[PDB]
Design a protein around this nucleic acid. Sequence first.
RNA 1: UUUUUUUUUUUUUUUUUUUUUUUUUUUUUUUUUUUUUU
RNA 2: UUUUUUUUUUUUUUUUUUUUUUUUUUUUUUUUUUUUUU
Lengths: 470, 436, 436, 470
Amino acid sequence: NATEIRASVGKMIDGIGRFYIQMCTELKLSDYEGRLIQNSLTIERMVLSAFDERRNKYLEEHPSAGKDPKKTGGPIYRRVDGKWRRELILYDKEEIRRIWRQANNGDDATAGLTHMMIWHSNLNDATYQRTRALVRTGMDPRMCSLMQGSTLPRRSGAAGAAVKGVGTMVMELIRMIKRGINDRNFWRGENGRRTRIAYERMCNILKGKFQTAAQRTMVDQVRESRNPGNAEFEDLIFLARSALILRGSVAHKSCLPACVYGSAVASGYDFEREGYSLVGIDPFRLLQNSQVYSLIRPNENPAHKSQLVWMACHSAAFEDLRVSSFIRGTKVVPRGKLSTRGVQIASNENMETMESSTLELRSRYWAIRTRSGGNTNQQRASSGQISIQPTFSVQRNLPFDRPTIMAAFTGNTEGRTSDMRTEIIRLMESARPEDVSFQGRGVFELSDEKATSPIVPSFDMSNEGSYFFG
Amino acid sequence: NATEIRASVGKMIDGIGRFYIQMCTELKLSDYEGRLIQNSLTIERMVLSAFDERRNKYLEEHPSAGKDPKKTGGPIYRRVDGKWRRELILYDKEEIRRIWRQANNGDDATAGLTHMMIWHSNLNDATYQRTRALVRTGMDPRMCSLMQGSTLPRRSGAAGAAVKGVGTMVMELIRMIKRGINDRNFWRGENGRRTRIAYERMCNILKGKFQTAAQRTMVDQVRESRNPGNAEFEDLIFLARSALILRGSVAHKSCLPACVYGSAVASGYDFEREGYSLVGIDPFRLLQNSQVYSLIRPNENPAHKSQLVWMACHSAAFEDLRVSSFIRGTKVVPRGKLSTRGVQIASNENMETMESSTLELRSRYWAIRTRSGGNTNQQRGRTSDMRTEIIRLMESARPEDVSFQGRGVFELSDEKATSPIVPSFDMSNEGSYFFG
Amino acid sequence: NATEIRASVGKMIDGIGRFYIQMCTELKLSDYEGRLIQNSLTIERMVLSAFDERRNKYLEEHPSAGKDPKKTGGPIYRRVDGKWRRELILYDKEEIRRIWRQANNGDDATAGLTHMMIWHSNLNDATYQRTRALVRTGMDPRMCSLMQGSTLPRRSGAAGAAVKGVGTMVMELIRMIKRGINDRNFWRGENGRRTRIAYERMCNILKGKFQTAAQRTMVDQVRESRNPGNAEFEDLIFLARSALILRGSVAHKSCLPACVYGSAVASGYDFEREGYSLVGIDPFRLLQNSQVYSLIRPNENPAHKSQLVWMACHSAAFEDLRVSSFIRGTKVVPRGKLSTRGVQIASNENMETMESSTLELRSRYWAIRTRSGGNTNQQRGRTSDMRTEIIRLMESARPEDVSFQGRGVFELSDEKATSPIVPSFDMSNEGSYFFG
Amino acid sequence: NATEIRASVGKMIDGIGRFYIQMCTELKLSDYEGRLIQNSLTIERMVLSAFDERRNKYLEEHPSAGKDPKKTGGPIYRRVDGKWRRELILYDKEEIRRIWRQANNGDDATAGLTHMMIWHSNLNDATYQRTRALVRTGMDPRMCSLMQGSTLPRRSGAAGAAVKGVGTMVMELIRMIKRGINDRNFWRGENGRRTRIAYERMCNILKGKFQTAAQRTMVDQVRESRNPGNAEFEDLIFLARSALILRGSVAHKSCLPACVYGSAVASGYDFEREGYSLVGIDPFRLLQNSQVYSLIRPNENPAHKSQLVWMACHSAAFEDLRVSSFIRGTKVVPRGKLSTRGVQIASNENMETMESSTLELRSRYWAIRTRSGGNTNQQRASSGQISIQPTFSVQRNLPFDRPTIMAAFTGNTEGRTSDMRTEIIRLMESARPEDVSFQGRGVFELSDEKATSPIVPSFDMSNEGSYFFG
RNA sequence: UUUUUUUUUUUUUUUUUUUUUUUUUUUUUUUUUUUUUU
RNA sequence: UUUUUUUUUUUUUUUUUUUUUUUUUUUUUUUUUUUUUU
């Protein structure tokens, strides 16, 4: 059943919106100031810093960074008669802990935490990607497309684990492998057992993420190494560059600004009654009647800022630019010529230059965002019979597929790293930049609610560039 | 003597046909509607749901699935002036229990039950095979050929046990082994004793099914493990992949549609007098003058549907395609390019698109279907030592060894197995593989 | 350092004595009634029934035994002008929980709980030993001497675990082994893991209790059996009958009546300041100026009752009678001819016959009670190979080997263990055996 | 609790009495004829022949003995104006089966069957004992005292098994041993397994019956012989002659004539309400107001017949004659000079000589009949310590009882047949014909109901003879 | 001439996947900024 | 200087027993009668 999931997510987002309402009440902010992305961003880093129970425990025993008992940051932006001023207001965690507890009807609301931290990961992926760490591990900077959910820490649950990219897992596992190579950390102690456990948990997340059997089997084989040394490093680099084309089925969770939920809840649009969805039309239509204000530099233009905000909201920064333009209806400028900077404001930037203005989020069309992959790799061992059974008593031969009969019996087991790299190469050669994907699905219009009739897009606009970076 | 067996099976099928006659009388169906496979299929799931005494006892204590006191399903298809309509008519078990009791002259007729449930297993094997469960147990999907009688539950008797495939038994035993591994279920209690008993019963069924001494001995030694753990899992997987070539002597019971028997009985062809057989010419000649109507989708073609129905009737879906074509006289299309779907109709499919038409069951020739193995086998401490002889026998095996010496395909006009004709195919590599 | 342990035990017993003072205040009992053992006994079963959190949780889900929400028993004995009357006054646990919490300065005082439950175990061992269970497990009734701390449940900590006898652990482990033999209880579930854990905890307690390397090694090897069946049963019976002579180093915790502590605390003798000890002179000198009243049957004599009470207080019921007589200065009658019964009074006994009188606890001498073994041990693939060395050590053992060299019995007037006097008994065979 | 057992036995005897009422109704017998022991005796052999399901199955496949489809015997005695006549009326089993089924409220009433068959065993033991079979097995005729419950077949349950004597079990086991010696009957077949099972069931019944540990252990040891040959024969004969003095705790079930229950039930004395007991005062007071008529030969005297009937009712034929006389208040004549014959009438005896008269069952006193033994054997291994533990740290010896320490360790196990016969002989020598038993219990008066105050009997009447046979 | 046993929740939307899927903590990092520098 | 874990019904009439204890069938016997006879 899907009604229960819809009711649960509706209750969750209703609690989130009511917490936004109460923060607006408590902060004594104006109507316009309640529609600013920066305030929600700072408040949500406060949120994560209050539920980072692991870091809370680590910092209680580590009283450093000067005045840091329980309070961090808090750069609240406020309006005086047109001008803007930032105040470093410090909030302790504990009162906000209870205000959450009262906001979700006595519950912890950790799922909502996962969605906000994923949405921060989405905005981070949209704005800046780290080839710095990608080459710190030595991997080439060609794979920036697989840094989805990179900023997400381990503390997130299965829902958070679903949206993390393959390359994010590759980076996380190489970090552990390099740490275990630097020092003899895999001893029989509890630390070794726990890092082992986290390792197989991340690995079965990986093998769940993939779709074709060959990569799943080679990930299974990679596990057989009890002592991760150097060979597994290139093994999993080969895994990553195979996933470049043999991409994993990674979900795309549609989270929206802290305000958008608050404005919707304030108007009385209860999500529990009519139901809510995270993949369907829902986050699209809530943005159809949403007003958002944002802060812009004197050199920054708002036209690219709105498009980057739409990137961050719908996590489409790693998609084809042409498709995003089609849903937008307007051309989406790649990051090469974006005359804008990061959404977040540096702590040293002055305030006389800063100017607030609206953001455009309206899109002409809407589409479903499933956690599926492209259809192209379909040529190997077609599932079929190997033996036959005599039904009629007729003097005839019994056809046996002998060369596979030896293959099943071989000797011990089967499957290797380079052996399977051979089929990786074969499949890559079979792959073409022409294979059309997502057959049977199309882009839909806003006026339709039940997915009745789509329109098939068709682009012949040469080589405008389907590459957000470079 | 063979006359007594023939008389018994003739009486049984006569009772079955008379029950078909009475259901036709009671359902107020027309002559054409009495020749529909779907009606017989639904009625026979009603049959199994009425004699599933174990499930009856389990569901009486488990009142779930909404309105389910005694009645399940019942999608009866009916004609209005060319068009078709399904009615969800619910029948309770008990009245049909007594109608059976009166249909077999006061007897339970459990053997007939076994043949109908086997025929459902035959149609299921013909239509869809489950690599889903085959890989749920982790076994590779290369052995779909040994899923014969897979849908058959344990409740069937020895006659039902004869036709179940080796792979079906492998799946059933691995299920029990995994259940005993998940929890400490082999205690000295009655449950452990009874599952133990069922285990040796299934195992001596297995060792009866095989023919060569080596596999019988290794099955004997697999029994010596009082605690089935993980090693026996690969042991019996090796047994299965050895039976891939060293196939077991599994019977092929020739059951026919619920209607075919009813039409034959209605015409007055008493089977007790002239005798009946389940392996010989009998089910062939009854189909020589049988008319069958069936329901077909607007995209489905009837040409492949008739061949699939012949598969289901004669359980030849696991045989060589070339031989089935020879008896048919027409080419039999493998499942790779069958532009058809399952015979059974989904509960949500609309009725304006559905169209009824005849099915062809005539075959140019007839052949005996014995429960023997290929002549190639006659030409040829732990489990691994015997695995060595398994490997050497597999190496000795060739894809050239001709089997079934001294037997041939026969013509319809002959009744006493007088003179056959030797077939000979040189048509390259058309493909002797129904799947793939 | 030993000062911290002395301060801790002094604080603990001071809290216990202050709780006794407050119960005397709250119960409105007279001065004489505050010196009765029966009242303290009933109050301390109330104590254990209030901290038996496991049983509290088990009984909250199990509302049986009629009126048993939170209150059990409570047979308070009171005096009217010489005569005696029992009232079944029921006290709930929770208020006494907070009165404890206020009695130990906001602490739970679980250690004191361990000492009171051990002292109940000491009195139980002094009064009655169960050959009933000893033969329920089938072990012979010759080993009644190793039933020390038998009544102690698992809930006690390491201090409680120290005083439990070897035979008590043998009984507890055989109970678990028989339970695991009756049903397949060692599955991979959490229950099996937890019983496994309790098993190695009890086993390393066992191997800590022993002194010679051979028995420690054979206990180590008994662990190697992942599935405890029947062989381990006789293996650990052999372990027990080896510990009959190769005794384990089991402590003897010197706990005293609930009143004795209360009278001492009431007089103002703070134990924190001057320090307190559980093994040294301390419990001896507190009894040198302690007055105790007790209830006696019209047929029971008080002379044997006082000696049995001294047994219960100092846990000397399993020691040689001659030594206990030497410290007493008077002959100690063995249980064979004790014309007395159990200290506790049956729920049906009438009250007109019951008579209260003093008890004598004065002893002429005092001695240290260490958790060591006899000096005789220092003078000296499977389980059977080590059983061979067990047999040869038993043969090397003699009933003549004198133990405890370098230590002696001391006089009361000395406080710092200056000069002892060596005892010497030549009084034939008076009988060094409390039972039989 | 004892109330439930009392209610169950009361319901059972109420059903029995109501069945007696209905048989009196159906047989068209007079009031006097309903108080005849012979009619109840014949009817109860009909009862056992109707529930002997094993024999029913054996005789259905064995149609012999002429006219014997379902009907056996049935010598009903009737009065014509003073004279007596027997009619061989044949009743089939099945209708009486349903009349029972309706008499116990839809139940089978097998327990009542056990009590009636035990009461037949009691009367048989009172009247005639078989030294014929006792010497057929070769055992001497000195042990006629242990033939209690000898006629009881195996079909009885645990309640029936409790009252069977030790010698009865000895005879039953020797029969099986001789059968297994004559032919190789202990094969691995089902028959051998089932006779094995019956063997250990009879043996743990035996070891439950005994009281002293030595005989229990030697019975345990006798079991260790997987192939019962000749040695076990003398082994169990030694067991029997040891039980001659070391008697087993065998119960004495107090069943009464078929009529006595019927007369009590007919008068309206419901046993369910006031409760009923099988060991206490109950069967005594029901006989205090019971009238019984019986058939007597022209040479037989009724005075000894009444005493023999009291023997049969209370199963006191194996007790001391002096005690039975004390409860009677009149001298009880031993079987040596009883000028009477068996209660049952031979099939050929004429009817002109037969005369009916009353029977006396009144007793001056009453006593409890427990399933306990005599107190005398109490001198062997007095349960006591073997080791000591040092409580005080004193320089002293550690007393160890070494000769028993070797005995526990010995080598393998311990206990034999002749080895234990040695302690049998020692105990027999310690036994005396003077040891008084049953201390703390006494004979009671009729007027008391709650066992308040007894009177101690004392006999100094020389050697009148405490031996019913000889 | 070879045979009707029952043990705690499954399945006809469909033909080779999906299963209604989840808050763990170990010795110093990061919002001056967008692909280097430590 | 060595430590509070919980898994389906027990126990203070009392000191070494008792445990509220149960319808299985395998090849020919027995009521002339009470200790022989086959």
